[PDB]
Design a protein around this ligand. Structure first.
Ligand code: SFG
Ligand code: A1IRH
Length: 226
């Protein structure tokens, strides 16, 4: 019942079952990551002018992908802004949980918001790709040997000139624990760039962070270049 127990039990299935351990933890209720809401830094950036420039540039077909959406809080936020948003998670339970949590959302009924059980590493990239991708508590969930494929998949999922927002969390330092892995902007930079493929347009410390997130989180905005 203790959070530390739930993390220890979670890290035990990931060692025994691997990627299939995520749907196991979702249906078993062991979801110590679920905060019920989007992180404040995401809203403040979008409502800022540095973020406004992206929301006003938004075309009438701007597509947003939220890998590892969980219950799809961030995905529902981007749909509320007018984006054709897709929430993708490996767990079919989580996708079913997101569809209940946002059942009354006008965007789920209209189709702007969509929740699908997809594999970030396996699903077919749409031809038009994605104008924006948001990664929170997904890169830090992947084991270290999957970060390079993560950045490789991000290079093809984001269209040229598109945006990849990465809320780097948790920035805990030398903590060698499993999920959630301690990450920094450097680890995200190495995975994304294999000035090769991306441009770090913004790297900021969020003004309004969750209290447990203070000092362990940075919002980084990447642009896909040629
Ligand atoms: N290869 C994958 N493709 C898609 N989703 C994945 C993959 N591996 C793990 N996940 C999902 O990533 C999520 C990680 C969780 N910490 C959820 C974090 C989620 N972003 C939240 O804020 O609640 C789980 O829902 C997993 O099912
Ligand atoms: C994948 C994953 C797992 C856990 C347990 C947590 S945490 O909320 O407890 O820190 C986070 C943020 C991500």
């Amino acid at each position: 019942a203790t959070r530390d127990e739930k993390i220890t039990y979670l890290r035990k299935i990931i060692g025994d079952k691997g990627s299939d351990a995520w749907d196991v933890a979702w249906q078993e209720g062991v979801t110590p990551w679920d905060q019920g809401k989007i992180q404040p830094p995401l809203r403040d950036f979008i409502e800022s002018n540095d973020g406004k420039a992206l929301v006003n540039k938004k075309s009438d077909n701007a597509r947003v992908l939220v890998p590892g959406c969980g219950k799809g809080y961030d995905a529902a936020y981007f749909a509320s802004l007018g984006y054709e948003t897709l929430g993708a998670d490996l767990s079919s339970t989580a996708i079913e949980k997101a569809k209940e949590f946002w059942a009354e959302s006008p965007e789920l009924k209209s189709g702007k918001l969509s929740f699908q059980t997809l594999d970030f590493f396996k699903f077919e990239v749409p031809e038009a790709k994605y104008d924006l991708v948001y990664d929170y508590t997904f890169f830090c969930a992947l084991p270290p040997d999957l970060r390079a494929p993560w950045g490789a998949r991000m290079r093809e999922l984001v269209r040229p000139g598109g945006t990849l927002i990465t809320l780097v969390y948790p920035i805990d330092g030398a903590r060698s624990g499993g999920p959630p892995y301690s990450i920094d902007v450097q680890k995200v930079t190495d995975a994304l760039q294999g000035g090769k493929y991306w441009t770090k347009v913004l790297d900021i410390v969020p003004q309004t962070s969750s209290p447990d997130h203070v000092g362990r989180e940075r919002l980084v905005v990447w642009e896909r270049i040629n």
